[PDB]
Design a protein around this ligand. Structure first.
Ligand SMILES: C[n+]1cn([C@@H]2O[C@H](COP(=O)(O)OP(=O)(O)O)[C@@H](O)[C@H]2O)c2nc(N)[nH]c(=O)c21
Lengths: 180, 14
């Protein structure tokens, strides 16, 4: 009853980006591992550097197998992302709680009917505040983007007075198409 | 195959 593994709906790949000024952005970009069970997810997560312990300029990306963590990818080019910008913390370490929660929404297929629209999530650790975002395939699918948004905010425990925004990738490349 | 947050967390340290 707990000896058998619990398979996820999708196979996910964890990517890591090291901001080493030696080779194109799409270079320091590396795939760390893939997993398709709850057990294997934890075996990876419990054994990799916490986001709060990553140095400035690095990112972690959890994306569905077959979707590279880049705007240009076929599943991201017409899509966008729900973006949360966070303050840096000399203590607290809340960045880890937010990222893990995000990971749980992705692997647990928390977006029901619209989990297929989800492409992945990215956490950027930067000197001026960190960022967490959930990428989706079509920035046009209003119902899907919007549902994913509401569920996510709730899951992050964000209050009614806060609101978060969704920006198209084509826009981030060149405001929010949605807000929840 | 969906999974509740609480369910997923029960597997982190077993
Ligand atoms: C997510 N992303 C970021 N970049 C490049 O990375 C730079 C850094 O953007 P960022 O890492 O998303 O946040 P930051 O500004 O706080 O560092 C962007 O200005 C682009 O030049 C990207 N460049 C490509 N080609 N594809 C991507 O998906 C992509």
């Amino acid at each position: 009853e707990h000896y058998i593994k619990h398979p996820l709906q999708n196979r996910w790949a964890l990517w890591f980006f090291k901001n080493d000024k030696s080779k194109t952005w799409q270079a320091n970009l590396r795939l760390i591992s893939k997993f398709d069970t709850v057990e294997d997810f934890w075996a990876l997560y419990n054994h990799i550097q916490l986001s709060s312990n990553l140095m400035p300029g690095c990112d972690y990306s959890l994306f569905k197998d077959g979707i590279e963590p880049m705007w240009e990818d076929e599943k991201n080019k017409r899509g966008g992302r729900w973006l949360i910008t966070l303050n840096k913390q000399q203590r607290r370490s809340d960045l880890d709680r937010f990222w893990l929660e995000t990971l749980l929404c992705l692997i647990g297929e928390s977006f029901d009917d619209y989990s297929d629209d989800v492409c992945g999530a990215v956490v950027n650790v930067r000197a001026k505040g960190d960022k967490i975002a959930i990428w989706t395939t079509e920035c046009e699918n209003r119902d899907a983007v919007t549902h994913i948004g509401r569920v996510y905010k709730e899951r992050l425990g964000l209050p009614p007075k806060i609101v978060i925004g969704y920006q198209s990738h084509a826009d981030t490349a060149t405001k929010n198409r949605f807000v929840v | 195959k969906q999974y509740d947050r609480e369910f997923l967390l029960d597997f982190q340290f077993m």
